Structure formats: C-alpha cells, structure tokens
C-alpha cells in the first residue's frame, strides 16, 4: 500500500560516479547499491544512499556480496552525519531483476520496517516511467504455498522535494516553462499516445508470448479479471457511444461557448487597441 | 527585356524590409526591455541609505553622522565635489 | 550550355576584353564548380584561338582553375619567345597569388636568363628583400604614446604589443630600439613575457631570412641560460616566425631540434615554429612527430600539436589527418586542447565548398559548444565567399539561436569570412547583429565589423563601434578598440574624420587610469594596428589579383 | 456477446433461465446482493438491462483472438494518435 | 552593360532573403527569454516581505524608506507600483536581505 | 615557480553536497574537506566533497577528525577510487559569503600542507534558482610580491572572474585574495539523464495522467469574467477625449494569454476523450 516518494537524484549522481567506479574496477558490469532513508507516510523522501562494492557469479546466481566492514561501520559514518537518514532500501540497475533481489531485501529487511528494492535507470531510455518501488509481499496464492516473497510492484515516482534548484535551474541553461498548450500538449500527446500504445504492444508481447510459449501466469488470476477493465469498452463497429454523443455535444457546449464569447471578447482585445496604437504610429508617424 | 523585368519586381517585394523594420526595431524594443529589466541586480546589494551631513573639511573628507548613529569621517566618490557639498 | 557559348566566344568583331570582363563577371555570378573549370578552361583557350593571346585570362586560370601544365607549356613559350617584359603577370602572379601547394606541384611540374629565372620568379626573393629594404628605410614612429603606454605594462599586452606595433610598422628592420632602451621594461618577464621577451626578435624579424640563424646566434637552444625553458622555446618559435613559407633546410632544422631527443621543453615554441614553417606544404615527418605530441597528453604543447599539424595540413583532405585528428577529440580530458585541435581540424579542410559538409554536420551535430565552435571554424574556411545558403541557413540558426556564446562568437566571425566579396550589404546585416543581449556576442559582432570590414571605407562602422565603447563590458570597448583599428588601417584622415579622433582618443582614454586594462588592453595594440606599417601595408584576405590569400586567413582566424 | 443492445430484454432470461417475470426482478437484486453485475435494470420495457459484470474464467481461444481488440486498440489508438498528430503536425514549431 | 547589372541584383537580393528568414526566429527566440527573464524576477521573494514605510523619493524608481529596524534608508524601487501609490508615509514591503521595494498595501492598522 | 589562471572542472556532486550542507546546514558556519585531484596546473578537478559530523561547536582548524580521515579514504578504497583530496569547504549560509576570520588561518593552515586547498563559500540560503552562489579564492600571500600579483597567462577567464569583482570585504580582500574559476563540467553523462528522468517524469510521470479537465474551467471562467470587467473598465479610460493621459499604461495583457492558452486547454481536453477512445 505504497503509491510514491520523493527522489533526490543528488545520490543518484553517486550512481552515476560509482557507474564510473564499476567501468575502470573489473568484472563488474551492473550498478548495484543500498538506499537509505526514512519512511514518512504513503508518500516519503529520499536524501541519501550507497553504492556495495558488489559481485555476483553467473553460476547459481544467489551470490550475494555486501560487506559488513561497508556496512557496519559506513553505518556508523551514516548515522553520525544524521541521525534521521537512515536505511530504507537498496538498488540495482536493468529494470528486471536478478534472482539473488530477494535475498539481498531480507538481508537489510531486519534493520528497516519495510527495505525496498528500487530498481534503478543508469542509461535512461524507457518507455514507461523511472526507477521504481517493491514493497515486502505476502500474496503467496489461492493454492496455499509456503509463503511468497517475491517483492510485488508497489509503485514509485520522481518526487521532488525542495530547494535545490540553486545548482539545478542554474544547471539546465537550455529549457524553458512551457504555457502549457504551446506542443506541450503534444509532447505529451507523443509520450502518452505512442508509449502507452507501445506498452500496449509489450501487453501484445505478454498476450502473445503467453500464448504461445507461456504457462502458469498465462491467466494467473489478474489477467482475465483485468480483461474485465480492457472489456470496459473494447467493441466492433464503432463501439456506439449513444448517450455520449449528445452528452460529448453537451461536453462541447462549455468550451466552444467559451470559444465564440471568449474568443470574440479576444477579438475585441486584439483588435481595437491594435488599431489604436496601429492607426496612431502610422498617421502620427508623420 | 524578358528576364529583364522580373529583378526590379522583386525589389517591388521589399516592404518586407519595412515590416521587419518595425520588427527589427520591435527586437531592440522589448530585447533592451529586458536588458533593462536585467540590470536589477544592482537593487541585489545596495540599500544605500540617506546620510546626514553636517559640513565638509579639507583633503577630500566629509563628516556623515549617519541617521540614528554617530561621527564617521570618510573619503568620497568622483561624480560629486567636494565644492558639492 | 557550351553551344551558343562557343558559338558566341568564336563570334565576330567587338572588343575581345568583353570577353576579359566577363572572366570575372561569370565569376561574379558563378553558382558552381561544374561550369565555372569548364568556362575557365575555355575562355583560355578562346584566347589560344583568336590570333592574340592574352595573359590575364592565364593569370586567372592558374589561380581558379589550377592547371601546372598548361603554365609548363607557355612558360616553355616564355623560354622560346623569350620576352621576359610580357611574362610578368603570369611569373609573378604565380609567385603572388597562388597556393603554396599549388607552389610546390608547380614547380614540380615547370622545371621539365629566364634558364635560371625560371627558378628564381619562384623562389621570388627580389620582392621579399627589396620589401624589407622598404621596411627599414620608411618610419613614422609615435613613442609618447609607447611611454604613456609603457606605464602600464604587466603580463599583459603592452609587453607584446609593444613590438607588434614597431614589428607591424617594421616587419624585419633588423635593428634594436626596445632592446636598446632599457633592460628593466625587459625585465617583467614571467613564461609569457618571457615567451614574449625571446619571441618577440623574430617577431620585429620577419622575413630577412638567411640571416635568421646568425641574428638569433644568441638564441640557439643551448645559448640562453636562464632557469626556464620559455625564454628558450619562444626564440625557436622565433625561427620558425622567419621560416615562414621558405625553407631550405631549417624547416627540417626545427623538425630535427624537436627531435634532439627534447620533450616539451624546447617543443614550448618550436612546435608552434615548426608548424608555422612548414604550412601547406604537406609533410610526413612532422605529423610523424606530431602524433606523439598529439599524444603527449599535456595541452601545454598539445595545443601547439593541435594547432602546429592543421598548419602543416592546410585543406589537406587527408584520410588521416582528418579522422586521427577528430579521433582524438573526444576522448581528451580537457577543451583547450579541443581549442588547438579546433583551429587544426578547421584549417585542414579549406575552402573546400561542397566537401567538408560531412564533418560540419556531424560536429555540430554533438552537444559540445567548443566542438560546436570547432564546427564553425571550420565552416569559416571550408566557405568563404560561397553564400549557397547552405552555408548560411543552418550558420545563422546556430549562430544566433544556441544557448553558449563562444560557437556564437566563432559563428560571427564566420560571417567576416564568408561576406567579404560585397561588403556594401554587411553594414546591414551587422548593425542588425548589434542588438545582441550578451557580451562575447557583442564582443564578437564587433570583431565581424572587423575582419568583415578591415579594407572598407565605412563610417557606419565606426557609427556602430561609439556606441559600443560606450558600454559598461570592457573587452566590448577593446573590440570597439581593434575592430576600429582594422577600420582604420590602410586609411587616412582625408578618408574618413574619425580616423585622428579615435588616434589621439585611445591615448586619451588610457590617460583614465581607473579604466580596466581589460578596457584598454588592446590599447596599444589599436595604437599598433592603427599603424600597421605605418599605413604602409595592409590586410589581404581577398587580393586584388582575384584569388584569395590563405595565409593572411591563417593569420587572422588564429588571430 | 461483446456488442451493444445491453437493455436487454428479459426474454432470454425467462426463456433459459427457467425463471418468470415476476422474478426477474429477484434473480437481479440477489445479485445485487451477490455483486458481480449491478444492472440498471428497465422496468417500463421490462428490460434486463446490462452494466459491468465479472467476465469469465478463461477464454484460451479468446486470449488468442482478442487481437481484433487488443492490437485493434494498439493500431487504431496509434492511427489516430498519427491523425491528429498528422493533422496538427506542423505546429510541432 | 547588358552582362551584369542585371545579374549582380540577386547577389545582394539572396542575403536579406535569409536575415527576413532569420529575424522571424530571433522574435521567436526573444519571447522565451523574456519570459525567463519575468520569473526570474520573481524568485528571490515576495514570501518572506518585510515591513518599513516610504518616506520621500528623490527621482525616477528611487526613493528613501524608513524602516521597522530602526534606521533610514534610501532604495531603488521598481517600476510595478503605480508613480502615485506612495504619498504618505504608508505600509510598503522590502526585502529581508537586499532592502528594495516590492509593494505597497494602503491600509493598517 | 610559476603562475597560471586555474580552473576547476566540477562534478556536479561537490555542489550537491554543499547544496544539501547548507540547507540541512543550519545557519551556523560549519568547515569540511574537499576532494577531487589535482591535474595538473593550469587545472583542477573536484571528484568529492564528503561529509561531515555535526561540528557544532565552532569553525576551527582542530575540528577535523583524522581517523575520519582514515576511514573515509579506506572506505572509498573498498570503494571504487581512492582519490586524493584537494582541499576543503566550509559554509557561510546566513550573511552574504565573504571569508571569516578563522579561514584566514585555516587557509593556509591546510595550504601548508596541500598545494592549493582552494576555499570553497556556499550560500543556498539566499533563495531558489537564478542566483549562482558559489564562491571560492585563491590565497595569495606576502611572499608572493616579489614578482607581480599577475598570473594573466590565459585571460578572459580571471577577467569574466573579474567580471563580478562585488564582495564588500572581499574586494576589500584583493589583498590576499584572488579568485580562482569556476565552470560546470560537461556534463551530459549526468545531464542526459538528468534531463531524461526531469522530462519523463516532471509530466504526469508514465504521461498517461490526464488525458481537473472542467470545474476547474467553471471557476476559471468565473476569474475570467470577474476580472474582464475591470478589465473594460480601459478603454473608457482610453476615451481622454482629446489627450489626458500619459502614457498607454496598458492592461490589454494577461487576459489574452491566460484564456489563449487556458481554453486550448479546455479544446484538447474535449479533443482527449475522443482521442483516448480511438
Ligand atoms: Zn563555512
């Protein structure tokens, strides 16, 4: 029951100087560290983090490295620094998961209420949205297994907190606040439109793959219920929005009402003061 | 004289060259409007407040005994004289 | 179309220099290199066909249309028909106004009285050495104002344009005043003023060339001993300075003391001499060496790499140059390095016209303002002249639309380069790019007014530039500064009334003592360019032979 | 039956349903109670009329061939985001 | 001179086509930046406002503003508030660091 | 022996961690150490500007913890780099930046061990975006006026640093203080992802959010006919018969463009239910 924090990409950054640490160390090809801080509300924030010298081998993959020398006693520093900045989670780049996730939750998951594994984004070029939120889950089936602990998408977002903007609005020297309807509008239109409809086709990729060569989640017991929320209103011909149509007229009422009063109100605005300073530089010009 | 119309023609077309002088001339307009409005943080150090002055002496100081304080004397700037005083 | 062309060059009888005018009219309104060889090579051989033949038609031909062996061929006539007296256009014109690659191929191709005259038009050092007989006897010297100036030297300009101004005045006068007239003055001398300080007899020292080595016989690499290499490597660079564009040996000379086994202490300035000695020519060896310098990893002669081996590589279209420079580029940890490979990559590819497209879409195709900026140096000599719009659209959107000002302020002096054909329409256009909002913009508006209008007879530039020292940004008051020096070279005080106003005002304005040096910091070197020769001499960036010349560019975009 | 026409009559329900008229109005508000479908029932037509409901267990062959939904949705949706964006396309600015 | 003065007339005719292209986009540019330039003179307060009371103006949008510190004070203002606006000594808004006026409220009291 | 016009290539951490030094960095000064490498000497980067305990007690040179010091390096020596430090920072987040008189001790202090140890002034508590407040010098000192106070070699950059010059003690401090140069890194190995995470996130974040949509429209055609009557009440003002008025003191504006872009808005939104169906 988490829906969103706030993020900092401060240590973020350190992601991004420990992706410079992981490119000239070794063997280690994939960014993955420990996320601290402290739980709020539904909503919470984030001001710092760290990055495991970390490895895993390629063979029985639950091989897990975070050391209690980087720990402990990097604890110790953490908690010396402040003492409100704690830990909250770790994190680890891709946007999948590798398998050791679960057990390198329930490692820190003894120090913290609710450790989360915020998978994050080093070479951003996703469709959806950013680094993302699991909570600790216990869903386990209808069947009554020993219990699930597979970390369930239990959202996230990029919050912002405050201030800040000293060094980052300082730092953007290329963008600008767009009046929204100004391409605004269709940039989102863009990203929404054709990302959503892309993510549609990785919709068509589950809906096809797990046709084909797809079992037990095939219609695990959110995908027909779900098929429900697509069958709002998935229909042949032209789907027949017959009480909408006259309700779309009466929706279309308030804004090109708006539009012939306002607008010829804008008319009048435009118009007659430009003829004034229009006609009075033109003649008194001479 | 076939092709020899349509240059001169095109130099008919240069009323461009007067809307965009009033466009150009718009450009300085409202480009030094905010160069102006630019110049605002001189506002960002200085509240630099009313002195009072009682008389002036020799070797370019004044006396300045500032609003609620006391005696400062003081050198002074170059766009005032001390015959100013 | 070459019908009625031909049917109207063998037509019947007006006067035949119709014809000869017309030579630099459909150069006037020439759009392409596709009929302008093919006009060029036939109006030459028009004149082989109407029973006179002409000399200016080969006086063009062999600077816009570049043939080695046609002038091989008729300078076999100047052997056989043995006038010397008629020969001077074209003997002299191909010493004047021709690519020093060109040179090179050219007297490669001609060698296959005028039996020995044939090598020495050439060489063509009467002209250079009766030039400098020239430089030493005239002078008009101002040295109130050298005092008056003199008062506020540092590590500064006054130290440097001291003797940029007597060394414009005298381009190799072979004598010492300022070494002569104190010491102490001398002795202000910190890496750049020592740099300066031995660098600085080379530059009053141009030209006078077989006396280069025993003049700065002092000033062998091992003769100086101070405790710092630059008041060593200047003087080498100071040799390099004389060896401009004729050798001999010494070109290798200052290839082989880069190479006397001497890392980044002698290469302080005898790289920048190398690379200024053997410009265009198009050597091996120097890049050879040059490459190790390229990767020398420390940009304090990695600049002068940089810089030094787009010199030696001028609009190479190398398949190496090119790439293993730009190759290079990216990965370095620093940008004043991509300065002097900036200049370097810029000045191997130019006045190409259609090739160099590739390259200058895919740097400014990168987020990089200085790779940007390299971008437009290099569309600055790649297109000089060819206003194509190609050029000129996506140049002015990102010359005035980009976000950083230093690609803008290269982009502005782009413009100088490619609108000096008609000047008359750059006053409004540049008026108009005035009205900037920023400072190296208005800066570099100014120096368009400048390197655009250096031979001009404009006074709205001069109305431009009053203004433009009248602002509170000091170094926009120093471009008011030059850019009116390089509006008052080459003219006098009957030319315009501003001339002697702007002379006696920038010692006037340096009588302020509370200005910035910054404000007057090219003060003294508007008093020197102000007199650049004495008015003796002048720019040449398009000669009046009608073909450009590439080392005055050279000179004044790393200028 | 995805289509339209969900005023249904109550005569599919009296016919195979094996109920009467004078309880279909049971047989819907016991699943009013139960909860899976909340009609708004017509009453001056009679009609059984049709809201959301709970769909289904499985449908395999449906979960193949719900393309003529699915990637209806996914091209069409596409297709007129491409139209007005078509339409509307140099405004880009 | 049928050859070239005819022909010399799209030499200097293709420039001013590109700068009529070019000024369009720098009117489309300046708009942003003016923009910018109005919220970046909104950012450094009009939260935290303090209190004085005007005094007297010398000039143009400048004046001298007594204070709720204790001390006298003579301040640039901006050009926001009406020329009119500050005829007695009334309830004005400053800036914490910095000391310029922002506004103006009548009423106290 | 030799002086040249410096130059610091940041990472963008080091001001992140002076940015958050100094909000969290309760007006009280506090003192720190910087960390980057020196390259070479024309130049200087910034990797690292760490963190500190809660030294509330006073700026002072005795306030730095050298088994800090140990376990820091060791800690980025288990860690990917171990680094070198340059110098140090320090916070002045109430008053207007200029040096305290324990940095003018502790300046060189630390600069008599270190090369540079260049100091770093941080202010974040001035206010939000437009102002550039950092601030950092060069301590120039008395043995140092032997030869001129006048490095130049690279100019342009100590002359867009002399561009500000604006400090009430500092230049004052010309003595003693000159400043070194500070530009932002070339940072598009952040500033891409920087700018990718701001833009797909900073609207509706998986972007399928709103497309609240009409009462909002109701209340805000209310303001616009609440305000459009004194907005008319213009050009009655306009009417001066002759000429009484100087000059236009125009109100024509933001009436346009509020419902210029408010009701493309309200027609985008009437176009979105059409475009969300099909
Ligand atoms: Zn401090």
Request: net charge negative.
């Amino acid at each position: 029951a988490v829906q969103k924090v706030v993020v900092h990409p401060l240590v973020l950054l350190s992601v991004v100087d420990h992706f410079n640490r992981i490119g000239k160390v070794g063997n280690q090809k994939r960014v993955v560290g420990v996320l601290l801080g402290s739980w709020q509300k539904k909503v919470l924030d984030v001001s710092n983090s760290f990055a495991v010298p970390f490895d895993e081998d390629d063979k029985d993959d639950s091989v897990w490295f975070l050391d209690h020398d980087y720990l402990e006693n990097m604890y110790g520093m953490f908690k010396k620094v402040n003492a409100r900045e704690r830990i909250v989670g770790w994190y680890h780049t891709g946007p999948k998961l590798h398998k050791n996730d679960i057990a390198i939750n329930e490692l820190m998951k003894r120090y913290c209420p609710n450790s989360v594994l915020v998978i994050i984004d080093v070479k951003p070029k996703d469709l959806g949205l950013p680094t993302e939120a699991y909570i600790s889950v216990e869903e386990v089936h209808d069947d009554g297994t020993p219990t699930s602990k597979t970390f369930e998408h239990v959202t996230s977002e990029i919050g912002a907190e405050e201030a800040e903007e000293v060094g980052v609005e300082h730092l953007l020297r290329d963008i600008k606040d767009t009046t929204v309807g100004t391409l605004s509008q269709r940039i989102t239109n863009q990203v929404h439109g054709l990302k959503g409809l892309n993510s549609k086709l990785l919709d068509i990729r589950s809906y096809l793959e797990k046709v084909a060569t797809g079992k037990l989640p095939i219609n695990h017991q959110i995908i027909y219920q779900l098929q429900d929320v697509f069958n709002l209103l998935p229909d042949v011909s032209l789907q027949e929005f017959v009480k909408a149509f006259y309700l779309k007229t009466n929706d279309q009422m308030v804004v090109v009402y708006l539009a012939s009063l306002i607008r010829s109100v804008v008319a009048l605005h435009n118009l007659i003061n430009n003829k004034i300073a229009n006609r009075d530089a033109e003649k008194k010009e001479g | 004289y076939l092709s020899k119309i349509e240059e001169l023609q095109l130099i008919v077309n240069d009323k461009s060259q007067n809307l965009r002088r009033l466009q150009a001339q718009r450009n300085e307009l409202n480009a030094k409007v905010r160069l102006l409005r630019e110049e605002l943080q001189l506002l960002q150090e200085q509240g630099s407040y009313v002195g009072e002055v009682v008389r002036a002496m020799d070797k370019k100081k004044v006396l300045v005994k500032v609003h609620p304080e006391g005696k400062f004397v003081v050198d002074v700037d170059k766009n005032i004289d001390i015959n100013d005083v | 179309r070459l019908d009625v062309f031909e049917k109207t060059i063998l037509e019947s009888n007006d006067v035949p220099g119709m014809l000869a005018y017309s030579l630099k009219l459909c150069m006037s309104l020439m759009q392409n290199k596709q009929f302008r060889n093919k006009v060029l090579r036939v109006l030459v051989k028009i004149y082989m066909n109407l029973e006179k033949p002409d000399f200016i038609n080969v006086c063009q031909c062999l600077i816009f249309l570049d043939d080695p062996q046609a002038v091989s061929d008729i300078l076999e006539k100047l052997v056989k028909e043995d006038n010397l007296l008629m020969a001077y256009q074209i003997c002299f014109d191909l010493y004047e106004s021709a690519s020093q690659q060109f040179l090179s191929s050219v007297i490669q191709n001609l060698r296959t009285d005028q039996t020995l005259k044939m090598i020495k038009i050439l060489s063509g050092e009467m002209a250079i050495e009766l030039h400098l007989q020239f430089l030493i006897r005239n002078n008009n010297t101002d040295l109130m104002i050298l005092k008056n100036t003199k008062d506020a030297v540092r590590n500064s300009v006054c130290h440097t344009a001291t003797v940029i101004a007597n060394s414009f005045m005298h381009c190799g006068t072979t004598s010492d005043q300022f070494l002569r007239d104190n010491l102490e003055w001398l002795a202000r001398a910190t890496n750049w003023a020592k740099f300066t300080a031995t660098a600085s007899l080379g530059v009053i020292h141009k030209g006078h060339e077989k006396e280069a080595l025993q003049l700065m016989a002092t000033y062998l690499p091992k003769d100086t001993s101070p405790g710092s290499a630059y008041q060593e490597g200047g003087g080498l660079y100071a040799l390099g300075l004389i060896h401009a564009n004729h050798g001999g040996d010494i070109i290798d000379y200052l290839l082989n003391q880069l190479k006397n086994a001497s890392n980044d202490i002698v290469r302080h300035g005898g790289s920048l001499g190398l690379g200024l000695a053997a410009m265009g020519t198009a050597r091996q060896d120097v890049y050879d060496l040059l490459k190790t310098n390229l990767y020398q990893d420390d940009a304090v002669t990695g600049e002068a790499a940089g810089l030094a081996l787009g010199l030696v590589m001028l609009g190479s279209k190398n398949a190496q140059a090119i790439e293993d420079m730009v190759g290079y580029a990216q990965e370095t940890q620093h940008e004043k390095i991509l300065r002097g490979l900036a200049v370097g990559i810029a000045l191997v590819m130019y006045g190409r016209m259609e090739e160099a497209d590739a390259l200058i879409e895919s740097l400014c195709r990168d987020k990089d303002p200085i790779l940007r900026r390299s971008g437009m140096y290099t569309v600055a000599m790649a297109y000089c002249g060819s206003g194509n719009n190609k050029a000129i659209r996506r140049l002015l959107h990102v010359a005035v639309s980009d976000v950083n000002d230093d690609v803008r302020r290269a982009a502005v002096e782009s413009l100088g380069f490619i609108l000096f054909r008609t000047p008359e329409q750059c006053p409004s256009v540049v008026s108009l790019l005035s009205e900037s909002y920023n400072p190296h913009v208005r800066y570099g508006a100014a120096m368009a007014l400048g390197i655009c209008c250096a031979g001009t007879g404009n006074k709205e530039a001069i109305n431009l530039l009053e203004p433009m020292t009248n602002d509170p940004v000091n170094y926009v008051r120093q471009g008011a500064l030059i850019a009116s020096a390089l509006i008052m070279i080459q003219q006098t005080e009957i030319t315009c009334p501003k001339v002697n106003q702007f002379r006696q005002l920038y010692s006037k304005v340096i009588n302020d003592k509370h200005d910035d040096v910054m404000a007057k910091f090219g003060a003294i070197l508007a008093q020197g360019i102000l007199d650049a020769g004495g008015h003796n001499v002048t720019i040449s960036l398009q000669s009046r032979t009608g073909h450009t010349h590439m080392p005055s560019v050279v000179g004044v975009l790393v200028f | 039956r995805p289509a339209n026409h969900r005023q249904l009559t109550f005569e599919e329900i009296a016919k195979s349903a094996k109920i009467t008229v004078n309880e279909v109005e049971l047989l819907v508000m016991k699943a009013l109670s139960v909860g899976l479908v909340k009609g708004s029932i017509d009453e001056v037509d009679k009609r059984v009329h049709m809201t959301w409901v709970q769909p289904r267990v499985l449908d395999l062959q449906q979960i193949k061939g719900m393309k003529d939904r699915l990637e209806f949705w996914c091209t069409d949706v596409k297709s007129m985001e491409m139209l007005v964006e078509h339409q509307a396309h140099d405004i880009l600015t | 001179d049928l050859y070239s003065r005819y022909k010399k007339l799209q030499q200097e005719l293709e420039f001013l086509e590109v700068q009529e292209e070019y000024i369009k986009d720098e009117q489309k540019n300046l708009k942003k930046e003016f923009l910018h330039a109005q919220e970046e003179v909104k950012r450094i307060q009009s939260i935290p406002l303090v209190i004085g009371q005007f005094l007297e103006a010398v000039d143009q949008n400048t004046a001298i503003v007594g204070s709720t510190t204790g001390s006298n004070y003579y301040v640039r203002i901006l050009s926001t508030i009406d020329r009119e606006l500050l005829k007695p000594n009334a309830s004005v808004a400053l800036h914490k660091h910095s000391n310029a006026l922002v506004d103006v409220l009548p009423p106290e009291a | 022996a030799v002086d040249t016009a410096e130059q610091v290539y940041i990472s963008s951490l080091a001001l992140l961690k002076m940015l958050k030094h100094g909000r969290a960095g309760v007006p009280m000064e506090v003192m720190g150490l910087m960390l980057g490498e020196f390259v070479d000497d024309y130049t200087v980067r910034v990797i690292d500007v760490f963190a500190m305990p809660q030294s509330g007690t006073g700026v002072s040179v005795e306030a730095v913890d050298p088994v800090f010091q140990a376990k820091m390096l060791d800690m980025l020596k288990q860690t990917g780099r171990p680094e070198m430090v340059v110098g140090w920072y320090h916070s002045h987040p109430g008053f207007g930046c200029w040096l305290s008189g324990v940095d003018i001790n502790t300046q060189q202090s630390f600069e008599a061990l270190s090369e540079r140890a260049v100091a770093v002034v941080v202010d974040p508590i001035q206010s939000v975006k437009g102002k550039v407040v950092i601030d950092a010098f060069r301590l120039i000192n008395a043995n140092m006026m032997v030869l001129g106070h006048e490095p130049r070699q690279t100019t342009s950059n100590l002359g867009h640093l002399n561009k500000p010059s604006i400090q009430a003690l500092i230049h004052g401090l010309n003595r003693h203080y000159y400043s070194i140069t500070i530009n932002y890194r070339k940072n598009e190995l952040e500033q891409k992802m920087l700018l990718n995470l701001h833009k797909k996130s900073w609207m509706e974040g998986l972007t399928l959010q709103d497309y609240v949509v009409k009462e909002m429209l109701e209340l805000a055609k209310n303001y616009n006919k609440a305000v459009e009557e004194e907005d008319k009440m213009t050009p009655e003002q306009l009417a001066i018969k002759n000429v009484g008025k100087q000059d236009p003191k125009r109100h024509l504006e933001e009436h346009v463009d509020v419902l210029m872009t408010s009701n493309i808005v309200q027609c985008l939104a009437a176009m979105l239910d059409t475009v969300v169906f099909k």
